[PDB]
Design a protein around this ligand. Structure first.
Ligand SMILES: [Mg+2]
Ligand SMILES: [Mg+2]
Ligand SMILES: [Mg+2]
Ligand SMILES: [Zn+2]
Ligand SMILES: [Zn+2]
Lengths: 160, 156
């Protein structure tokens, strides 16, 4: 089974530069082409897993209720349009917590470590996403809106 | 002559709630609308949104309440490559007895187009009547029985 492990903020949707928290609906914005391109990847046989660090989620620094609105709407868009994430894996911890689950640590994905390592990828916009790939023994794709965007990824990962 | 699809908003592109999408938690996309509109654009159809928003811009439905969800809906469509030539809105109450409320044709007079291959797509009898008044085809959108995948297949 080929899997794509996909970061959320800065990858599926834009990342707010002030506080890195999508905690209001007016901060939710989809990255270009993510929907048709994930549908294309699924049609080529990829299954999808979301993985994300949501620093302080569920505490007063990032209330669960504030995260839920935009996140649940985002998920409603994906599901209604046919994009199905097998799991949504969330680390809610602060860096200072020194938790076992914060990417690029692999605790959240340990069950996958099971999959076709040659043809599975992490897709994310940060060096930590690329390090997650290395830690999982799979390939990493560094999402960039201009130079490695959703249409390019859709093409690259279906090349034969 | 250009092929057009005149598409209702509430109950057609997005779910219809008090019949007002005036909160973000009331916004929800209809199944398959994005990939199917993309398929339809590739088949050469141009898209025009047309919607009755009862009492929009009054105390009953402040413009600001409409704007948030609508603009987010537009962000999503646009970011995914779906483009509407125009978004045509009637903001009036039925009791206003205005000139622009579907199925009256005021909003679309400029189009009055390849009529044999143009459609109104909407979920209400009034959308179908709009089609009749415009002299083009009508498709009665129904999430269960005549939905986006079915429309995408039929028109391509
Ligand atoms: Mg990121
Ligand atoms: Mg961070
Ligand atoms: Mg309707
Ligand atoms: Zn953690
Ligand atoms: Zn009117």
């Amino acid at each position: 089974q080929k899997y794509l492990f996909i970061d959320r903020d800065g990858t599926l949707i834009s990342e707010p530069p002030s506080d890195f928290q999508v905690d209001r609906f007016d901060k939710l914005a989809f990255e270009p082409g993510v929907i048709p391109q994930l549908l294309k990847l699924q049609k080529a046989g990829y299954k999808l897993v979301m993985i994300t660090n949501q620093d302080g989620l569920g505490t007063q620094s990032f209330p669960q209720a504030d995260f839920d609105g935009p996140h649940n709407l985002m998920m409603q868009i994906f599901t209604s349009q046919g994009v199905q994430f097998d799991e949504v894996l969330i680390c809610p911890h602060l860096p200072a917590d020194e938790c076992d689950c914060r990417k690029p640590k692999v605790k959240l994905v340990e069950r996958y470590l099971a999959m076709d390592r040659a043809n599975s990828y992490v897709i994310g916009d940060r060096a930590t996403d690329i390090q997650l790939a290395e830690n999982m023994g799979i390939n990493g794709l560094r999402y960039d809106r201009e130079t490695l965007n959703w249409p390019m990824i859709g093409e690259q990962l279906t090349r034969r």
